[PDB]
């Protein structure tokens, strides 16, 4: 069992925070060390709590480094994170997703496709970089999501893999218009209600189980997960905002063992099973007193299962894929009269005659269509082009353009247009 390349980068990296002397509060020669200059552990809560913004979960690698280099379950608020930040490459990746809710008024589901990189801001921290959002077959309503069967689910995964990408998590909307003059949205998820349902916590835990973090220090070989979960809801300003979560490892275990239950008409709480024997399950809560009040997890406020993860839009944006003024359409959107077929591609390619062909072709959703469409599936000769995209290799793109297979895509579009 072999860890991710980022977990192999991280384990071979010094996590400390070094300091030369400080001017006023150091009491020794230029060479000596003392409690005020000796380096800082990547798990020291003092350092983290006093950052801006104050961090309250150490990095996972900061945690196992902290560990000196049918009984009853008791849940504590978890002191470490698996992913430390979710960074959308750019606002366009996330706005085109919300486009589905703006058009239909139904909530919408996506899969975050991107990569795991270093998050240099936080000691040993991991960042999840979101580069595409795959929208699968699904039925949405005003007040509910439903996943449909995805025949292409793992052809998608195979294409993205040759793009440098993997599923880093999922996204859903919970968006409701507030003010229909101003164009605002309700601010429904806050301290006084909830940020993630018991419902959504169980499915979060399910996804995290189904997507385990490989780790050489576990007998299972699995431990934790890097599968983040992202919410699009109105914010305190009644504008759409994105919120990053994960669910505690303890909470993964409950869902794995089918012990976690939702509460009806109570999203902010969830049940724990009674009998299938169930070790009684507790949690070490926080009151007002400051007494470590232990309680029985029937009910359980979901907040003792949820892990905040910062969501960033970078000051300098990244473009794994290209921004068209009139982009190729996204999958599963015929509902809104916006379909992927050879008419679309024909007008897409005509619109981009004067463009760098690498930019024109560097679209995730286009690439899925090219490989999986049923008129002409380029399912086997796309490897060449997938690599031109992953690499921003313009010469490598220009040659594939001269392929037999691309020529016939092009005479297809040409006679589609010739029939118009
Ligand atoms: Zn000193």
From Swiss-Prot:
<dbReference type="GO" id="GO:0036435">
    <property type="term" value="F:K48-linked polyubiquitin modification-dependent protein binding"/>
</dbReference>
<dbReference type="GO" id="GO:0051117">
    <property type="term" value="F:ATPase binding"/>
</dbReference>
<keyword id="KW-0143">Chaperone</keyword>
<keyword id="KW-0007">Acetylation</keyword>
<keyword id="KW-0963">Cytoplasm</keyword>
<dbReference type="GO" id="GO:0036503">
    <property type="term" value="P:ERAD pathway"/>
</dbReference>
<keyword id="KW-0862">Zinc</keyword>
<comment type="pathway">
    <text>Protein degradation; proteasomal ubiquitin-dependent pathway.</text>
</comment>
<dbReference type="GO" id="GO:0008270">
    <property type="term" value="F:zinc ion binding"/>
</dbReference>
<comment type="subunit">
    <text>Heterodimer with UFD1. The heterodimer binds ubiquitinated proteins. The heterodimer binds to VCP and inhibits Golgi membrane fusion. Interacts with ZFAND2B; probably through VCP.</text>
</comment>
<keyword id="KW-0256">Endoplasmic reticulum</keyword>
<keyword id="KW-0833">Ubl conjugation pathway</keyword>
<keyword id="KW-0863">Zinc-finger</keyword>
<dbReference type="GO" id="GO:0044877">
    <property type="term" value="F:protein-containing complex binding"/>
</dbReference>
<protein>
    <recommendedName>
        <fullName>Nuclear protein localization protein 4 homolog</fullName>
    </recommendedName>
</protein>
<keyword id="KW-0539">Nucleus</keyword>
<dbReference type="GO" id="GO:0005654">
    <property type="term" value="C:nucleoplasm"/>
</dbReference>
<comment type="similarity">
    <text>Belongs to the NPL4 family.</text>
</comment>
<dbReference type="GO" id="GO:0034098">
    <property type="term" value="C:VCP-NPL4-UFD1 AAA ATPase complex"/>
</dbReference>
<dbReference type="GO" id="GO:0007030">
    <property type="term" value="P:Golgi organization"/>
</dbReference>
<feature type="domain" description="MPN">
    <location>
        <begin position="86"/>
        <end position="223"/>
    </location>
</feature>
<dbReference type="GO" id="GO:0005634">
    <property type="term" value="C:nucleus"/>
</dbReference>
<dbReference type="GO" id="GO:0042175">
    <property type="term" value="C:nuclear outer membrane-endoplasmic reticulum membrane network"/>
</dbReference>
<comment type="function">
    <text>The ternary complex containing UFD1, VCP and NPLOC4 binds ubiquitinated proteins and is necessary for the export of misfolded proteins from the ER to the cytoplasm, where they are degraded by the proteasome. The NPLOC4-UFD1-VCP complex regulates spindle disassembly at the end of mitosis and is necessary for the formation of a closed nuclear envelope. Acts as a negative regulator of type I interferon production via the complex formed with VCP and UFD1, which binds to RIGI and recruits RNF125 to promote ubiquitination and degradation of RIGI.</text>
</comment>
<keyword id="KW-0479">Metal-binding</keyword>
<dbReference type="GO" id="GO:0039536">
    <property type="term" value="P:negative regulation of RIG-I signaling pathway"/>
</dbReference>
<dbReference type="GO" id="GO:0070530">
    <property type="term" value="F:K63-linked polyubiquitin modification-dependent protein binding"/>
</dbReference>
<dbReference type="GO" id="GO:0031625">
    <property type="term" value="F:ubiquitin protein ligase binding"/>
</dbReference>
<dbReference type="GO" id="GO:0032480">
    <property type="term" value="P:negative regulation of type I interferon production"/>
</dbReference>
<dbReference type="GO" id="GO:0005783">
    <property type="term" value="C:endoplasmic reticulum"/>
</dbReference>
<dbReference type="GO" id="GO:0030970">
    <property type="term" value="P:retrograde protein transport, ER to cytosol"/>
</dbReference>
<dbReference type="GO" id="GO:0006511">
    <property type="term" value="P:ubiquitin-dependent protein catabolic process"/>
</dbReference>
<dbReference type="GO" id="GO:0036501">
    <property type="term" value="C:UFD1-NPL4 complex"/>
</dbReference>
<dbReference type="GO" id="GO:0005829">
    <property type="term" value="C:cytosol"/>
</dbReference>
<dbReference type="GO" id="GO:0043161">
    <property type="term" value="P:proteasome-mediated ubiquitin-dependent protein catabolic process"/>
</dbReference>
<dbReference type="GO" id="GO:0043130">
    <property type="term" value="F:ubiquitin binding"/>
</dbReference>
